[PDB]
Amino acid sequence: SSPVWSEPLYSLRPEHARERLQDDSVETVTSIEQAKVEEKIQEVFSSYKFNHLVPRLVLQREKHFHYLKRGLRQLTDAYECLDASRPWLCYWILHSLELLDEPIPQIVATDVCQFLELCQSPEGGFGGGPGQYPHLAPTYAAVNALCIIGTEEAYDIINREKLLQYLYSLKQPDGSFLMHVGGEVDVRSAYCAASVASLTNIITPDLFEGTAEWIARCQNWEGGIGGVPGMEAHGGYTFCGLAALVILKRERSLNLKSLLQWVTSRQMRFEGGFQGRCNKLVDGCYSFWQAGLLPLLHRALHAQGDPALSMSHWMFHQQALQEYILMCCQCPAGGLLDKPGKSRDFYHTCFCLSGLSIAQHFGSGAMLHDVVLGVPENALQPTHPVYNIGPDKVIQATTYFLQKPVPGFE
Template identity: 40%
Template sequence: MPLFEFHDLRQLQKDDDVRTESSREQASTEGTLNKFYNPYIQKQALFFDSLVLFIEEHTKFAKKGLRTLPSYFDSLDASRPWFCFWCCNALSMLPNLGNDPTLVSDFSNFLGNFCQDKEKGGIAGGPGQLSHVAPTFSGTIALCALKANQGLDLIDKQKMYSFLYSLKDPVSKGFRMHVDGEVDTRGCFCALIVATVLNIMDDKLTEGVAEYIVNCQTYEGGIGAYPGVEAHGGYTYCGLAAMMFMKKAHLLDLDSLTHWLARRQMSYEGGFQGRTNKLVDACYSFWVGASFPLLEAALVSLKDPKDRTELDQQILDYLQWQPPTLDSETRIKYTPKTFSLKDTLKKIKTHHNSEEYCQIEEMEATEPYLDLQDSEWMFNQTALQEYLLLCCQQESGGLRDKPVKQPDFYHTCYALFGLSISQHNPSGSLAVLGDCKNLLRQINPLFQMCTDSVSNVLNYYGGRTSV
């Protein structure tokens, strides 16, 4: 395996000698990460073979969130289905759930009988609370991740549909997070993934939603929470995924979206930021990292079916997603100018090298410096794995935003999601950095759970293998 000159390929910030608060924070972050990267840089041959994911420790950490939590978690009492989602998904990617035979029945009972509103539908953040589309999403997907069909049987699909429809805003056509709550792209994603999983999606639910999300795409290319606000990695994923569920991702400006996503991978750190001029954060390993497979599938959908390659079909199969049937006029209208990956990277690189252009956080679009010939996503999978394995693991268990932060269940789940995406390619080839035992189970980035769990629930609700 060839070695590389780390600092030749992973550049520190360039601030044009103009010191700002954000440039000082960036320099401080790079200085902190340098302490983790330096031993790696000095002893690459050793580190390439010895980088280890602390599987046993992360397993123990995730299990802590499943039963009894310390009193200082009281402020998150309205987020209890999220703990089910984060911890069960984290454990599902690791070797096994351990010796807890009552987990499925206990969670099915808790989410289906105690958190579900039996009168109005939907799932609340805790027993006796108001139904909310976010815990409705997290609770439903947690049951799917556990393959808890007995828990899914407890969900009243008719009342769930009524609940989701009650959240549609008659003016914007987007979805509210709860009755009289805010309208944003999160609400659209949460409502549509639940409707997709439970097989209750129809035109009445989706009416006007695509137009709302298109209006949330910003001049930068990413997607904001609602029209007129800054593009954000989490909302970009939510908006893009929602469009995928409606088979309308091609309506977005995929050209500018590609460029915005490509610029979120940090030059020195290797991880992703969530917004322009912000710091790296491990959770965006998923929110941004997962957007690339969705984007590639959206691009494939614009190809004439007879022109699709074997890899194109593998991308669709990876997401368990069937593209819409588009006529030639629609394909021509919405196909971006920089359609191919090669042309996209060339254009981005040229843009980066122009004298008038300088962004301290953007990553050069070079060929992967580690010889992973099967790297097929539009980001540097090796650099992301380096950041997660070297900088984000707590040796006692759990993953964190960055080294100055403490591990938590949220970042543990989404960092592992991102790590899984960077290890698995649609062709079935693997790109695992370090010890071969670091390999996680494959997740489906569109559904936020392991691929076999997606297959189980799609088959359970309608005998489907894809959507």
Template identity: 60%
Template sequence: MTLNPPNTPTRLSSTQYFMTLNPPTKRIMSQPTRSVLKPVGCVTIGSQIDCVCSLCKPAVVLVLDPIVSIVCVFSLWCLDASRPWLCYWILHSLELLEEPVPTSIASERAVGGGASETGSGGRGVGDGQWGAGRRRRAVGGGCSSSRCDVVLNPPREKLLSFLFSVKQTDGSFVIHGGGEVDIRSAYCAASVAPLTNIMTPTLFQDTPTNWEGGLGGVPGLEAHGGYTFCGTAAVVILGKEHMLDLKTLLQWVASRHMRFEGWFQGRCNKLVDGCYSFWQAGLLPLATLFKEGKSTETITVLP
């Protein structure tokens, strides 16, 4: 018989938790016809009708409100290892919609305080899990919820030590000790280090620009949409845009936009995927800032 430790919330499946959310669930089910997109105008081009849509903010918030409670506060069986980045995406969406995050959500537990401490300066996302790059995602989620003050446990010194421990001799980062090299780790580190004011001149070096113009998961591999966005965003955050070849980067991104499907593919000769509309299209504003010689918005740094 397994007993939960003291003060540990009961682990629920997503279905079980939804059963406890009668008011929010009824509120969503009572409005089945509401769409997150609403048409603002249509034009006829030949035999096709092209409609321009805008985001229906109330409908999106209606969906996000109960989800943020499920993911960020309660323990779930499913997607347990993905909690930090799920919290990050949901909280970031609320921030973009200029919606306040409830105080009960913007807490240490909500942004990873219930995760297991590893003693290395990193943090696992659940009991018994290793400290990993997702700790950095949890910090980003906490700062998205305007609660940067609650995510710095362990202290910044240990967090910096952890970042150096996962940095490799070629300048790349692994997700966790003994793990794989992944440029997304570099992005997480590059975003968290300025936020927590632990930047050092030796923490970041070099950039793995690919022969295609994009960036791969590790130096020398095929360019990929998600990796290219993360790598480009990292160098923009670090103020090292000059290390990128802007012309070949833009050529590579433009080539990933498929004429027939209208969406983006992640790699050459691959199928389109909705997620790449974020990763690939998100590169364009970053490249524009670089081309115009403008710096990114000031990052809020902890004292």
């Protein structure tokens, strides 16, 4: 076959050029923008090929590590726009470090715990910063961050009694949840609530009454799920919807057939990465939101006894996604990105890596099959498809909280 120092790539096959956009000689804003991206991506792909010599791809772990380590402590005023999302920054950075198997010093861990405690609201839940009103987004992020740390100190920071009361204060009669008091409603809330409620063992029989039905109403004609009933299928909202239903054990409420066909169609034939909506551009962060749906669908179909399911691969092109992330989404200075030409940020660093991990690891029952493209060191730690934190962290957290009673309920 091939010497160990050369690894043929899918994106470099001669026939891959046939995957370039065919605009049928009818130009519109959509095709013009798509063509521009493909042109740049082809240039990038070609830079990794030297005729028959194709060096193994390398995840610049050290560069990413230093970028993350610095951000966990300090940020420039360029992040003032995220002053109401500091728990998000904690989660994005800690999860990235977790995926890279970079240890978190005990001191830093304790400091994160203390900071998130300051973000916790007396009414329950966490806000975007100290003294801010609670909101399901930073609440979801804070809980995931504390679970990544996984110490009893981190676990005990969460005021479970008030958290459940807070979730109740956001629950609507139609099954949906507000993102915060007097705030907006969309499927993100159902997932944020289901995620933190299941991890901390505070689910009551009535908490999610009608929620599964509401989420199902969000699935549309495309097969994907929109933010609210009637809206366009979107990768981020679809992940939220399916992940929430998986937590509620109500995945069957959806048409899994149309959902599967929709998400698989979101992988770009040329770029290899995923788009968030039909006819929109590729974006590295959808490597997780979209690709993450495949392990969830695999699990759902497996629970139904689907005899046709693969026992070694997810139903998306795992290699092509890794090729897009490794060749197109890494910032040479550290950190990951949306696409070539975009600047790095912690959000994309978190999700590009999360998506890379999903693409590298397949697991079902007693079967495990890894596909790590490039040098062996590229292997990332696995991530749980529902919570997007390490599976070990999920088990440890769920086990810890299951030892506590549901707040004021039997």
